[PDB]
PDB file of C-alpha atoms and ligand atoms in Angstrom:
ATOM      1  CA  UNK S 204     -20.300 -46.446 -61.092  1.00 33.19           C
ATOM      2  CA  UNK S 205     -22.697 -45.448 -58.244  1.00 37.69           C
ATOM      3  CA  UNK S 206     -23.056 -46.869 -54.734  1.00 41.02           C
ATOM      4  CA  UNK S 207     -26.465 -46.261 -53.216  1.00 39.97           C
ATOM      5  CA  UNK S 208     -26.264 -44.574 -49.752  1.00 39.06           C
ATOM      6  CA  UNK S 209     -28.977 -43.899 -47.166  1.00 42.90           C
ATOM      7  CA  UNK S 210     -32.366 -42.767 -48.183  1.00 41.80           C
ATOM      8  CA  UNK S 211     -32.653 -39.046 -47.479  1.00 39.68           C
ATOM      9  CA  UNK S 212     -36.412 -38.640 -48.174  1.00 37.89           C
ATOM     10  CA  UNK S 213     -39.028 -38.668 -50.889  1.00 37.88           C
ATOM     11  CA  UNK S 214     -39.677 -36.719 -54.040  1.00 41.20           C
ATOM     12  CA  UNK S 215     -42.851 -35.861 -55.967  1.00 40.34           C
ATOM     13  CA  UNK S 216     -42.283 -39.197 -57.757  1.00 42.58           C
ATOM     14  CA  UNK S 217     -39.810 -41.886 -56.389  1.00 41.42           C
ATOM     15  CA  UNK S 218     -37.394 -41.976 -53.627  1.00 40.09           C
ATOM     16  CA  UNK S 219     -34.282 -39.797 -53.012  1.00 38.14           C
ATOM     17  CA  UNK S 220     -30.981 -41.151 -51.863  1.00 41.51           C
ATOM     18  CA  UNK S 221     -27.618 -39.850 -50.750  1.00 42.99           C
ATOM     19  CA  UNK S 222     -25.304 -41.731 -52.870  1.00 43.42           C
ATOM     20  CA  UNK S 223     -21.700 -42.119 -54.037  1.00 43.71           C
ATOM     21  CA  UNK S 224     -19.917 -42.043 -57.407  1.00 42.39           C
ATOM     22  CA  UNK S 225     -17.254 -44.741 -56.415  1.00 42.93           C
ATOM     23  CA  UNK S 226     -14.686 -43.312 -58.860  1.00 43.46           C
ATOM     24  CA  UNK S 227     -14.983 -39.665 -57.742  1.00 42.21           C
ATOM     25  CA  UNK S 228     -17.653 -37.826 -55.954  1.00 42.92           C
ATOM     26  CA  UNK S 229     -20.722 -37.895 -53.706  1.00 42.38           C
ATOM     27  CA  UNK S 230     -24.118 -37.427 -55.602  1.00 40.31           C
ATOM     28  CA  UNK S 231     -27.919 -37.496 -55.106  1.00 40.01           C
ATOM     29  CA  UNK S 232     -29.834 -40.520 -56.483  1.00 39.48           C
ATOM     30  CA  UNK S 233     -33.380 -40.519 -57.579  1.00 40.17           C
ATOM     31  CA  UNK S 234     -35.048 -44.036 -58.081  1.00 41.18           C
ATOM     32  CA  UNK S 235     -38.274 -44.892 -59.824  1.00 43.16           C
ATOM     33  CA  UNK S 236     -39.565 -48.594 -60.090  1.00 41.82           C
ATOM     34  CA  UNK S 237     -39.365 -49.558 -63.702  1.00 40.80           C
ATOM     35  CA  UNK S 238     -42.592 -51.294 -63.869  1.00 40.23           C
ATOM     36  CA  UNK S 239     -45.011 -50.392 -61.042  1.00 38.64           C
ATOM     37  CA  UNK S 240     -47.236 -48.149 -63.133  1.00 35.14           C
ATOM     38  CA  UNK S 241     -47.228 -45.115 -65.426  1.00 35.87           C
ATOM     39  CA  UNK S 242     -43.649 -43.934 -65.691  1.00 38.34           C
ATOM     40  CA  UNK S 243     -42.495 -40.443 -64.847  1.00 36.81           C
ATOM     41  CA  UNK S 244     -38.720 -40.333 -64.094  1.00 40.52           C
ATOM     42  CA  UNK S 245     -37.595 -40.461 -67.752  1.00 40.56           C
ATOM     43  CA  UNK S 246     -39.859 -37.530 -68.691  1.00 41.44           C
ATOM     44  CA  UNK S 247     -38.537 -35.426 -65.776  1.00 43.87           C
ATOM     45  CA  UNK S 248     -35.086 -36.249 -66.878  1.00 43.84           C
ATOM     46  CA  UNK S 249     -35.954 -34.907 -70.264  1.00 44.08           C
ATOM     47  CA  UNK S 250     -36.991 -31.619 -68.776  1.00 40.66           C
ATOM     48  CA  UNK S 251     -33.829 -31.332 -66.766  1.00 37.91           C
ATOM     49  CA  UNK S 252     -31.880 -31.790 -70.018  1.00 39.03           C
ATOM     50  CA  UNK S 253     -34.009 -29.134 -71.791  1.00 38.85           C
ATOM     51  CA  UNK S 254     -33.213 -26.818 -68.664  1.00 38.10           C
ATOM     52  CA  UNK S 255     -29.499 -27.757 -68.923  1.00 39.18           C
ATOM     53  CA  UNK S 256     -27.162 -24.910 -68.870  1.00 36.42           C
ATOM     54  CA  UNK S 257     -29.368 -22.414 -66.974  1.00 33.33           C
ATOM     55  CA  UNK S 258     -28.203 -20.645 -63.855  1.00 33.80           C
ATOM     56  CA  UNK S 259     -29.341 -22.575 -60.783  1.00 32.94           C
ATOM     57  CA  UNK S 260     -30.388 -25.524 -62.970  1.00 34.58           C
ATOM     58  CA  UNK S 261     -28.878 -28.750 -61.539  1.00 31.33           C
ATOM     59  CA  UNK S 262     -26.712 -31.048 -63.772  1.00 29.65           C
ATOM     60  CA  UNK S 263     -27.763 -34.531 -64.297  1.00 31.47           C
ATOM     61  CA  UNK S 264     -24.767 -36.930 -64.603  1.00 31.30           C
ATOM     62  CA  UNK S 265     -26.411 -40.131 -65.723  1.00 30.40           C
ATOM     63  CA  UNK S 266     -29.928 -41.397 -66.309  1.00 31.56           C
ATOM     64  CA  UNK S 267     -30.967 -44.917 -67.116  1.00 34.42           C
ATOM     65  CA  UNK S 268     -32.292 -48.209 -65.870  1.00 33.58           C
ATOM     66  CA  UNK S 269     -30.285 -50.491 -63.480  1.00 31.61           C
ATOM     67  CA  UNK S 270     -32.254 -53.705 -62.706  1.00 31.55           C
ATOM     68  CA  UNK S 271     -35.521 -53.031 -61.057  1.00 29.97           C
ATOM     69  CA  UNK S 272     -35.245 -49.273 -60.978  1.00 28.80           C
ATOM     70  CA  UNK S 273     -35.163 -46.243 -63.257  1.00 27.07           C
ATOM     71  CA  UNK S 274     -32.205 -44.156 -61.915  1.00 27.20           C
ATOM     72  CA  UNK S 275     -31.268 -40.530 -62.265  1.00 29.07           C
ATOM     73  CA  UNK S 276     -27.995 -39.201 -60.711  1.00 24.32           C
ATOM     74  CA  UNK S 277     -27.749 -35.515 -60.045  1.00 25.42           C
ATOM     75  CA  UNK S 278     -24.817 -33.407 -58.883  1.00 25.44           C
ATOM     76  CA  UNK S 279     -25.015 -32.994 -55.072  1.00 23.43           C
ATOM     77  CA  UNK S 280     -26.570 -29.751 -53.827  1.00 22.54           C
ATOM     78  CA  UNK S 281     -26.680 -28.223 -50.484  1.00 23.59           C
ATOM     79  CA  UNK S 282     -29.622 -27.728 -47.995  1.00 27.99           C
ATOM     80  CA  UNK S 283     -33.000 -26.657 -49.111  1.00 27.53           C
ATOM     81  CA  UNK S 284     -34.462 -23.389 -48.054  1.00 27.63           C
ATOM     82  CA  UNK S 285     -36.770 -25.261 -45.691  1.00 25.85           C
ATOM     83  CA  UNK S 286     -33.745 -26.929 -44.227  1.00 22.61           C
ATOM     84  CA  UNK S 287     -32.014 -23.587 -43.782  1.00 19.51           C
ATOM     85  CA  UNK S 288     -35.165 -21.970 -42.485  1.00 17.38           C
ATOM     86  CA  UNK S 289     -35.115 -24.600 -39.613  1.00 17.02           C
ATOM     87  CA  UNK S 290     -31.334 -24.058 -38.989  1.00 18.88           C
ATOM     88  CA  UNK S 291     -31.963 -20.287 -38.852  1.00 16.71           C
ATOM     89  CA  UNK S 292     -34.756 -20.815 -36.162  1.00 18.84           C
ATOM     90  CA  UNK S 293     -37.537 -20.575 -38.688  1.00 17.55           C
ATOM     91  CA  UNK S 294     -37.203 -16.903 -39.229  1.00 18.35           C
ATOM     92  CA  UNK S 295     -35.336 -15.082 -42.017  1.00 16.06           C
ATOM     93  CA  UNK S 296     -34.111 -11.562 -41.873  1.00 17.29           C
ATOM     94  CA  UNK S 297     -35.485  -9.141 -44.380  1.00 14.32           C
ATOM     95  CA  UNK S 298     -32.188  -8.960 -46.109  1.00 15.66           C
ATOM     96  CA  UNK S 299     -32.109 -12.723 -46.547  1.00 10.99           C
ATOM     97  CA  UNK S 300     -35.673 -12.785 -47.888  1.00 11.81           C
ATOM     98  CA  UNK S 301     -34.859 -10.144 -50.439  1.00 10.64           C
ATOM     99  CA  UNK S 302     -31.685 -11.872 -51.557  1.00 12.93           C
ATOM    100  CA  UNK S 303     -33.598 -15.038 -52.049  1.00 14.43           C
ATOM    101  CA  UNK S 304     -36.480 -13.355 -53.656  1.00 13.53           C
ATOM    102  CA  UNK S 305     -34.188 -11.911 -56.335  1.00 12.78           C
ATOM    103  CA  UNK S 306     -32.842 -15.237 -57.416  1.00 12.08           C
ATOM    104  CA  UNK S 307     -36.113 -17.271 -57.034  1.00 13.23           C
ATOM    105  CA  UNK S 308     -38.057 -14.945 -59.295  1.00 14.85           C
ATOM    106  CA  UNK S 309     -35.290 -15.503 -61.778  1.00 15.14           C
ATOM    107  CA  UNK S 310     -35.263 -19.350 -61.540  1.00 16.05           C
ATOM    108  CA  UNK S 311     -38.966 -19.173 -62.180  1.00 14.49           C
ATOM    109  CA  UNK S 312     -38.515 -16.785 -65.025  1.00 11.96           C
ATOM    110  CA  UNK S 313     -35.915 -19.236 -66.541  1.00 12.76           C
ATOM    111  CA  UNK S 314     -38.234 -22.190 -66.354  1.00 11.12           C
ATOM    112  CA  UNK S 315     -41.063 -20.094 -68.056  1.00 10.55           C
ATOM    113  CA  UNK S 316     -38.523 -19.133 -70.790  1.00 10.92           C
ATOM    114  CA  UNK S 317     -38.109 -22.767 -71.675  1.00 11.55           C
ATOM    115  CA  UNK S 318     -41.885 -23.159 -72.098  1.00 13.16           C
ATOM    116  CA  UNK S 319     -42.630 -24.871 -68.781  1.00 11.49           C
ATOM    117  CA  UNK S 320     -44.393 -24.158 -65.508  1.00  9.66           C
ATOM    118  CA  UNK S 321     -43.204 -25.748 -62.289  1.00 11.66           C
ATOM    119  CA  UNK S 322     -46.433 -26.020 -60.406  1.00 11.50           C
ATOM    120  CA  UNK S 323     -44.974 -26.751 -56.972  1.00 10.32           C
ATOM    121  CA  UNK S 324     -43.007 -23.767 -55.842  1.00 11.30           C
ATOM    122  CA  UNK S 325     -42.054 -24.230 -52.225  1.00 13.21           C
ATOM    123  CA  UNK S 326     -38.997 -23.847 -50.021  1.00 15.61           C
ATOM    124  CA  UNK S 327     -38.158 -27.628 -50.174  1.00 14.27           C
ATOM    125  CA  UNK S 328     -37.741 -27.337 -53.976  1.00 16.38           C
ATOM    126  CA  UNK S 329     -34.967 -24.566 -53.833  1.00 17.81           C
ATOM    127  CA  UNK S 330     -31.519 -25.755 -52.729  1.00 16.82           C
ATOM    128  CA  UNK S 331     -28.256 -23.823 -52.271  1.00 16.32           C
ATOM    129  CA  UNK S 332     -25.306 -24.919 -54.261  1.00 15.17           C
ATOM    130  CA  UNK S 333     -21.971 -26.110 -52.814  1.00 12.75           C
ATOM    131  CA  UNK S 334     -18.490 -24.749 -52.956  1.00 13.73           C
ATOM    132  CA  UNK S 335     -18.063 -22.091 -55.615  1.00 14.92           C
ATOM    133  CA  UNK S 336     -21.834 -22.186 -55.998  1.00 15.77           C
ATOM    134  CA  UNK S 337     -22.662 -21.936 -52.298  1.00 16.07           C
ATOM    135  CA  UNK S 338     -24.338 -18.605 -52.841  1.00 15.73           C
ATOM    136  CA  UNK S 339     -26.478 -19.789 -55.816  1.00 14.42           C
ATOM    137  CA  UNK S 340     -30.143 -20.809 -55.344  1.00 12.91           C
ATOM    138  CA  UNK S 341     -31.103 -23.855 -57.437  1.00 14.31           C
ATOM    139  CA  UNK S 342     -34.656 -25.103 -58.333  1.00 13.55           C
ATOM    140  CA  UNK S 343     -35.378 -28.731 -58.413  1.00 16.07           C
ATOM    141  CA  UNK S 344     -38.117 -31.320 -59.030  1.00 14.45           C
ATOM    142  CA  UNK S 345     -40.038 -31.061 -62.319  1.00 13.81           C
ATOM    143  CA  UNK S 346     -42.240 -34.154 -61.614  1.00 13.55           C
ATOM    144  CA  UNK S 347     -45.246 -31.726 -61.664  1.00  9.26           C
ATOM    145  CA  UNK S 348     -43.920 -29.534 -64.425  1.00 11.16           C
ATOM    146  CA  UNK S 349     -46.113 -28.840 -67.443  1.00 11.19           C
ATOM    147  CA  UNK S 350     -45.539 -27.227 -70.866  1.00 13.87           C
ATOM    148  CA  UNK S 351     -47.612 -24.145 -70.929  1.00 12.76           C
ATOM    149  CA  UNK S 352     -46.907 -22.978 -74.452  1.00 15.82           C
ATOM    150  CA  UNK S 353     -46.095 -24.608 -77.774  1.00 15.34           C
ATOM    151  CA  UNK S 354     -42.292 -24.825 -78.458  1.00 12.74           C
ATOM    152  CA  UNK S 355     -42.722 -23.518 -82.087  1.00 14.12           C
ATOM    153  CA  UNK S 356     -45.720 -21.274 -82.051  1.00 10.61           C
ATOM    154  CA  UNK S 357     -45.625 -20.184 -78.435  1.00  6.93           C
ATOM    155  CA  UNK S 358     -49.394 -20.636 -78.401  1.00  7.00           C
ATOM    156  CA  UNK S 359     -50.552 -20.738 -74.756  1.00  4.71           C
ATOM    157  CA  UNK S 360     -52.290 -23.782 -73.409  1.00  6.29           C
ATOM    158  CA  UNK S 361     -56.106 -23.273 -73.145  1.00  7.42           C
ATOM    159  CA  UNK S 362     -57.943 -22.001 -70.128  1.00  4.24           C
ATOM    160  CA  UNK S 363     -59.465 -24.887 -68.147  1.00  2.36           C
ATOM    161  CA  UNK S 364     -61.700 -25.328 -65.026  1.00  3.39           C
ATOM    162  CA  UNK S 365     -62.658 -27.901 -62.525  1.00  2.99           C
ATOM    163  CA  UNK S 366     -59.157 -29.310 -62.121  1.00  2.19           C
ATOM    164  CA  UNK S 367     -57.910 -31.109 -59.010  1.00  2.00           C
ATOM    165  CA  UNK S 368     -55.354 -29.298 -56.967  1.00  2.00           C
ATOM    166  CA  UNK S 369     -51.824 -30.216 -57.886  1.00  2.00           C
ATOM    167  CA  UNK S 370     -48.838 -29.292 -55.755  1.00  2.00           C
ATOM    168  CA  UNK S 371     -48.749 -28.278 -52.217  1.00  2.00           C
ATOM    169  CA  UNK S 372     -51.938 -26.877 -50.665  1.00  2.00           C
ATOM    170  CA  UNK S 373     -50.008 -24.471 -48.245  1.00  2.00           C
ATOM    171  CA  UNK S 374     -48.490 -22.414 -51.229  1.00  2.00           C
ATOM    172  CA  UNK S 375     -51.005 -23.029 -53.934  1.00  2.00           C
ATOM    173  CA  UNK S 376     -52.482 -19.991 -55.668  1.00  2.00           C
ATOM    174  CA  UNK S 377     -56.098 -18.984 -55.103  1.00  2.00           C
ATOM    175  CA  UNK S 378     -57.134 -19.870 -58.652  1.00  2.00           C
ATOM    176  CA  UNK S 379     -55.573 -23.396 -58.284  1.00  2.00           C
ATOM    177  CA  UNK S 380     -57.789 -23.873 -55.168  1.00  2.00           C
ATOM    178  CA  UNK S 381     -60.694 -22.799 -57.445  1.00  2.00           C
ATOM    179  CA  UNK S 382     -59.889 -25.462 -59.937  1.00  2.00           C
ATOM    180  CA  UNK S 383     -58.322 -23.320 -62.745  1.00  2.00           C
ATOM    181  CA  UNK S 384     -55.378 -24.632 -64.814  1.00  2.00           C
ATOM    182  CA  UNK S 385     -52.059 -23.342 -63.621  1.00  2.00           C
ATOM    183  CA  UNK S 386     -50.028 -20.821 -65.697  1.00  2.00           C
ATOM    184  CA  UNK S 387     -47.073 -18.616 -65.064  1.00  2.00           C
ATOM    185  CA  UNK S 388     -48.829 -16.242 -62.713  1.00  2.00           C
ATOM    186  CA  UNK S 389     -49.477 -19.184 -60.316  1.00  2.00           C
ATOM    187  CA  UNK S 390     -45.857 -20.114 -59.872  1.00  2.00           C
ATOM    188  CA  UNK S 391     -45.213 -16.469 -58.984  1.00  2.00           C
ATOM    189  CA  UNK S 392     -48.145 -16.269 -56.690  1.00  2.00           C
ATOM    190  CA  UNK S 393     -46.954 -19.308 -54.828  1.00  2.00           C
ATOM    191  CA  UNK S 394     -43.536 -17.768 -54.515  1.00  2.00           C
ATOM    192  CA  UNK S 395     -45.248 -14.688 -52.859  1.00  2.00           C
ATOM    193  CA  UNK S 396     -46.722 -16.989 -50.281  1.00  2.00           C
ATOM    194  CA  UNK S 397     -43.242 -18.540 -49.738  1.00  2.00           C
ATOM    195  CA  UNK S 398     -41.718 -15.126 -49.157  1.00  2.00           C
ATOM    196  CA  UNK S 399     -44.434 -14.210 -46.579  1.00  2.00           C
ATOM    197  CA  UNK S 400     -43.794 -17.660 -44.947  1.00  2.00           C
ATOM    198  CA  UNK S 401     -40.184 -16.749 -44.474  1.00  2.00           C
ATOM    199  CA  UNK S 402     -41.109 -13.290 -43.192  1.00  2.00           C
ATOM    200  CA  UNK S 403     -43.835 -14.485 -40.797  1.00  2.00           C
ATOM    201  CA  UNK S 404     -42.467 -17.973 -39.770  1.00  2.00           C
ATOM    202  CA  UNK S 405     -45.759 -19.499 -40.876  1.00  2.00           C
ATOM    203  CA  UNK S 406     -48.850 -18.758 -43.021  1.00  2.00           C
ATOM    204  CA  UNK S 407     -52.338 -18.234 -41.398  1.00  2.00           C
ATOM    205  CA  UNK S 408     -53.693 -21.320 -43.252  1.00  2.00           C
ATOM    206  CA  UNK S 409     -51.041 -23.732 -41.868  1.00  2.00           C
ATOM    207  CA  UNK S 410     -52.035 -26.532 -39.503  1.00  2.00           C
ATOM    208  CA  UNK S 411     -55.749 -26.984 -40.307  1.00  2.00           C
ATOM    209  CA  UNK S 412     -57.139 -30.573 -39.994  1.00  2.00           C
ATOM    210  CA  UNK S 413     -60.428 -31.998 -41.226  1.00  2.00           C
ATOM    211  CA  UNK S 414     -61.828 -35.471 -42.216  1.00  2.00           C
ATOM    212  CA  UNK S 415     -61.141 -35.806 -45.974  1.00  2.00           C
ATOM    213  CA  UNK S 416     -58.461 -34.130 -47.917  1.00  2.00           C
ATOM    214  CA  UNK S 417     -61.012 -32.182 -49.836  1.00  2.00           C
ATOM    215  CA  UNK S 418     -62.238 -30.597 -46.651  1.00  2.00           C
ATOM    216  CA  UNK S 419     -58.813 -29.653 -45.534  1.00  2.00           C
ATOM    217  CA  UNK S 420     -57.950 -28.001 -48.921  1.00  2.00           C
ATOM    218  CA  UNK S 421     -61.407 -26.219 -48.546  1.00  2.00           C
ATOM    219  CA  UNK S 422     -60.337 -24.854 -45.230  1.00  2.00           C
ATOM    220  CA  UNK S 423     -57.083 -23.507 -46.699  1.00  2.00           C
ATOM    221  CA  UNK S 424     -58.863 -22.094 -49.822  1.00  2.00           C
ATOM    222  CA  UNK S 425     -61.330 -20.248 -47.549  1.00  2.00           C
ATOM    223  CA  UNK S 426     -58.696 -18.927 -45.280  1.00  2.00           C
ATOM    224  CA  UNK S 427     -56.683 -17.725 -48.295  1.00  2.00           C
ATOM    225  CA  UNK S 428     -59.703 -16.123 -49.944  1.00  2.00           C
ATOM    226  CA  UNK S 429     -60.942 -14.459 -46.725  1.00  2.00           C
ATOM    227  CA  UNK S 430     -57.559 -12.959 -45.789  1.00  2.00           C
ATOM    228  CA  UNK S 431     -56.853  -9.776 -47.609  1.00  2.00           C
ATOM    229  CA  UNK S 432     -53.340  -9.262 -48.910  1.00  2.00           C
ATOM    230  CA  UNK S 433     -53.084  -6.215 -46.739  1.00  2.00           C
ATOM    231  CA  UNK S 434     -53.945  -8.261 -43.714  1.00  2.00           C
ATOM    232  CA  UNK S 435     -51.533 -11.074 -44.426  1.00  2.00           C
ATOM    233  CA  UNK S 436     -48.698  -8.589 -45.051  1.00  2.00           C
ATOM    234  CA  UNK S 437     -49.575  -6.183 -42.202  1.00  2.00           C
ATOM    235  CA  UNK S 438     -46.506  -4.802 -40.589  1.00  2.00           C
ATOM    236  CA  UNK S 439     -44.114  -5.641 -43.400  1.00  2.00           C
ATOM    237  CA  UNK S 440     -42.808  -3.442 -46.263  1.00  2.00           C
ATOM    238  CA  UNK S 441     -45.483  -2.688 -48.941  1.00  2.00           C
ATOM    239  CA  UNK S 442     -43.449  -4.523 -51.619  1.00  2.00           C
ATOM    240  CA  UNK S 443     -44.702  -7.856 -50.567  1.00  2.00           C
ATOM    241  CA  UNK S 444     -48.320  -6.842 -50.902  1.00  2.00           C
ATOM    242  CA  UNK S 445     -47.612  -5.123 -54.145  1.00  2.00           C
ATOM    243  CA  UNK S 446     -46.045  -8.307 -55.356  1.00  2.00           C
ATOM    244  CA  UNK S 447     -48.881 -10.574 -54.359  1.00  2.00           C
ATOM    245  CA  UNK S 448     -51.502  -8.229 -55.892  1.00  2.00           C
ATOM    246  CA  UNK S 449     -49.548  -8.069 -59.084  1.00  2.00           C
ATOM    247  CA  UNK S 450     -49.512 -11.925 -59.313  1.00  2.00           C
ATOM    248  CA  UNK S 451     -53.204 -12.192 -58.509  1.00  2.00           C
ATOM    249  CA  UNK S 452     -54.227  -9.728 -61.127  1.00  2.00           C
ATOM    250  CA  UNK S 453     -52.259 -11.258 -63.962  1.00  2.00           C
ATOM    251  CA  UNK S 454     -54.487 -12.828 -66.763  1.00  2.00           C
ATOM    252  CA  UNK S 455     -54.196 -16.485 -67.387  1.00  2.00           C
ATOM    253  CA  UNK S 456     -52.030 -16.185 -70.443  1.00  2.00           C
ATOM    254  CA  UNK S 457     -50.155 -12.954 -69.312  1.00  2.00           C
ATOM    255  CA  UNK S 458     -46.432 -12.848 -69.521  1.00  2.00           C
ATOM    256  CA  UNK S 459     -45.314 -11.669 -66.004  1.00  2.00           C
ATOM    257  CA  UNK S 460     -43.200  -8.670 -65.678  1.00  2.00           C
ATOM    258  CA  UNK S 461     -40.367 -10.555 -63.850  1.00  2.00           C
ATOM    259  CA  UNK S 462     -38.078  -7.404 -63.982  1.00  2.00           C
ATOM    260  CA  UNK S 463     -40.702  -5.247 -62.289  1.00  2.00           C
ATOM    261  CA  UNK S 464     -41.227  -7.864 -59.491  1.00  2.00           C
ATOM    262  CA  UNK S 465     -37.511  -7.998 -58.781  1.00  2.00           C
ATOM    263  CA  UNK S 466     -37.183  -4.234 -58.967  1.00  2.00           C
ATOM    264  CA  UNK S 467     -39.765  -3.894 -56.334  1.00  2.00           C
ATOM    265  CA  UNK S 468     -37.553  -5.921 -53.880  1.00  2.00           C
ATOM    266  CA  UNK S 469     -34.307  -4.396 -55.104  1.00  2.00           C
ATOM    267  CA  UNK S 470     -35.655  -0.866 -54.299  1.00  2.00           C
ATOM    268  CA  UNK S 471     -36.671  -1.975 -50.934  1.00  2.00           C
ATOM    269  CA  UNK S 472     -33.285  -3.612 -50.347  1.00  2.00           C
ATOM    270  CA  UNK S 473     -31.549  -0.284 -51.103  1.00  2.00           C
ATOM    271  CA  UNK S 474     -33.914   1.806 -49.063  1.00  2.00           C
ATOM    272  CA  UNK S 475     -33.188  -0.448 -46.031  1.00  2.00           C
ATOM    273  CA  UNK S 476     -29.407   0.160 -46.434  1.00  2.00           C
ATOM    274  CA  UNK S 477     -28.416  -3.392 -47.255  1.00  2.00           C
ATOM    275  CA  UNK S 478     -25.362  -4.434 -49.254  1.00  2.00           C
ATOM    276  CA  UNK S 479     -25.456  -7.191 -51.821  1.00  2.00           C
ATOM    277  CA  UNK S 480     -22.565  -9.206 -50.357  1.00  2.00           C
ATOM    278  CA  UNK S 481     -24.687 -12.472 -50.544  1.00  2.00           C
ATOM    279  CA  UNK S 482     -24.370 -13.058 -46.876  1.00  2.00           C
ATOM    280  CA  UNK S 483     -27.505 -15.082 -45.868  1.00  2.00           C
ATOM    281  CA  UNK S 484     -28.581 -15.660 -42.302  1.00  2.00           C
ATOM    282  CA  UNK S 485     -27.062 -19.223 -42.521  1.00  2.00           C
ATOM    283  CA  UNK S 486     -23.631 -17.733 -43.477  1.00  2.00           C
ATOM    284  CA  UNK S 487     -23.573 -16.163 -39.971  1.00  2.00           C
ATOM    285  CA  UNK S 488     -23.917 -19.387 -38.040  1.00  2.00           C
ATOM    286  CA  UNK S 489     -20.954 -19.833 -35.801  1.00  2.00           C
TER     287      UNK S 489
HETATM  288  C1  GEW C 590     -22.592 -33.307 -47.835  1.00  2.00           C
HETATM  289  O1  GEW C 590     -23.240 -33.448 -46.548  1.00  2.00           O
HETATM  290  C2  GEW C 590     -24.691 -33.629 -46.406  1.00  2.00           C
HETATM  291  C3  GEW C 590     -25.199 -33.554 -45.217  1.00  2.00           C
HETATM  292  C4  GEW C 590     -26.659 -33.732 -45.012  1.00  2.00           C
HETATM  293  C5  GEW C 590     -27.416 -34.100 -46.171  1.00  2.00           C
HETATM  294  O2  GEW C 590     -28.738 -34.182 -46.189  1.00  2.00           O
HETATM  295  C6  GEW C 590     -29.291 -34.778 -44.894  1.00  2.00           C
HETATM  296  C7  GEW C 590     -26.804 -34.141 -47.477  1.00  2.00           C
HETATM  297  C8  GEW C 590     -27.744 -34.515 -48.642  1.00  2.00           C
HETATM  298  C9  GEW C 590     -28.319 -33.151 -49.167  1.00  2.00           C
HETATM  299  C10 GEW C 590     -29.223 -33.276 -50.374  1.00  2.00           C
HETATM  300  O3  GEW C 590     -30.371 -33.783 -50.304  1.00  2.00           O
HETATM  301  N1  GEW C 590     -28.743 -32.961 -51.602  1.00  2.00           N
HETATM  302  C11 GEW C 590     -29.471 -33.018 -52.923  1.00  2.00           C
HETATM  303  C12 GEW C 590     -30.913 -33.339 -52.837  1.00  2.00           C
HETATM  304  C13 GEW C 590     -31.568 -33.426 -54.106  1.00  2.00           C
HETATM  305  C14 GEW C 590     -33.086 -33.749 -54.111  1.00  2.00           C
HETATM  306  C15 GEW C 590     -33.763 -34.464 -55.110  1.00  2.00           C
HETATM  307  C16 GEW C 590     -33.169 -35.293 -56.279  1.00  2.00           C
HETATM  308  C17 GEW C 590     -33.631 -34.927 -57.557  1.00  2.00           C
HETATM  309  C18 GEW C 590     -33.066 -35.540 -58.613  1.00  2.00           C
HETATM  310  C19 GEW C 590     -32.115 -36.547 -58.487  1.00  2.00           C
HETATM  311  F1  GEW C 590     -31.561 -37.171 -59.578  1.00  2.00           F
HETATM  312  C20 GEW C 590     -31.577 -36.738 -57.266  1.00  2.00           C
HETATM  313  C21 GEW C 590     -32.163 -36.076 -56.105  1.00  2.00           C
HETATM  314  N2  GEW C 590     -34.979 -34.469 -54.843  1.00  2.00           N
HETATM  315  C22 GEW C 590     -35.305 -33.691 -53.735  1.00  2.00           C
HETATM  316  N3  GEW C 590     -36.592 -33.550 -53.189  1.00  2.00           N
HETATM  317  N4  GEW C 590     -36.850 -32.911 -52.173  1.00  2.00           N
HETATM  318  C23 GEW C 590     -38.270 -32.842 -51.806  1.00  2.00           C
HETATM  319  C24 GEW C 590     -39.216 -33.409 -52.610  1.00  2.00           C
HETATM  320  C25 GEW C 590     -40.544 -33.397 -52.385  1.00  2.00           C
HETATM  321  C26 GEW C 590     -41.007 -32.629 -51.239  1.00  2.00           C
HETATM  322  F2  GEW C 590     -42.410 -32.555 -50.890  1.00  2.00           F
HETATM  323  C27 GEW C 590     -40.002 -32.112 -50.402  1.00  2.00           C
HETATM  324  C28 GEW C 590     -38.787 -32.143 -50.643  1.00  2.00           C
HETATM  325  N5  GEW C 590     -34.059 -33.294 -53.242  1.00  2.00           N
HETATM  326  C29 GEW C 590     -33.847 -32.495 -52.128  1.00  2.00           C
HETATM  327  C30 GEW C 590     -30.886 -33.171 -55.213  1.00  2.00           C
HETATM  328  C31 GEW C 590     -29.450 -32.854 -55.214  1.00  2.00           C
HETATM  329  N6  GEW C 590     -28.897 -32.914 -54.025  1.00  2.00           N
HETATM  330  C32 GEW C 590     -25.425 -33.959 -47.514  1.00  2.00           C
END
């Protein structure tokens, strides 16, 4: 039922295409070769299905195999926060950062409530909705997602060390750089780096080259460990440093206090005099 359009980029696993549901609507299409190596697309599809119904969780319309590809068809979403960041001249107003922070914490909480961690929290994996959902932040891409507790007993996965970094180095938590198994705290710590990225326009560990990838990650790790939160966040409201310190002090199997983290930013929002009219920076482009 689906005509494949132009390739719009790559995902954590497989290629992404702008596509068309010939009968009705435009859609997004993810393809994975059915026989190249270890398969991933069908597991990710199963996670989306477990996530179904949650606020800001995309709907899948069909998932199967068509010839030489495993295919997943997703409702079309709007631009990613990295796209919108570029469109807003790579700087977000405080109001927009706080509006985004409120929803993004909630999306991460939702994923955690369904027993999974995302492990690649970054602007590219959050997309705005379209039409009646144009003010809603969605989260995408479960290719790196992992179950962190047992569905029946809620027994947390064990602590593990000497792991290779998974996800994007720019936003990875310090413990991830140190080879620790990722848990709920790490999704939230990554979000903290995303919010300061939006505030600052960059992070101080961006753009570092080296010979091998290990050395580059090592530079990023060292720069992150050697930059105190009060220096990273210098000049910005204290809530951002409070947020990051809170995430960095969580124990491996701690349940984060998502409400407290949201309340930090909500209190700031109201002390700044902003109104929750869901008018983001991009809503003001002329
Ligand atoms: C209507 O006018 C338009 C004008 C311009 C447009 O764009 C040029 C568009 C198209 C917008 C669009 O892209 N919409 C969209 C995308 C995704 C998606 C999937 C996806 C997932 C599952 C599926 F089944 C299908 C697609 N994967 C992703 N990965 N992004 C990554 C991954 C890894 C990275 F390191 C960085 C970024 N994305 C963004 C899902 C749903 N909607 C429209």
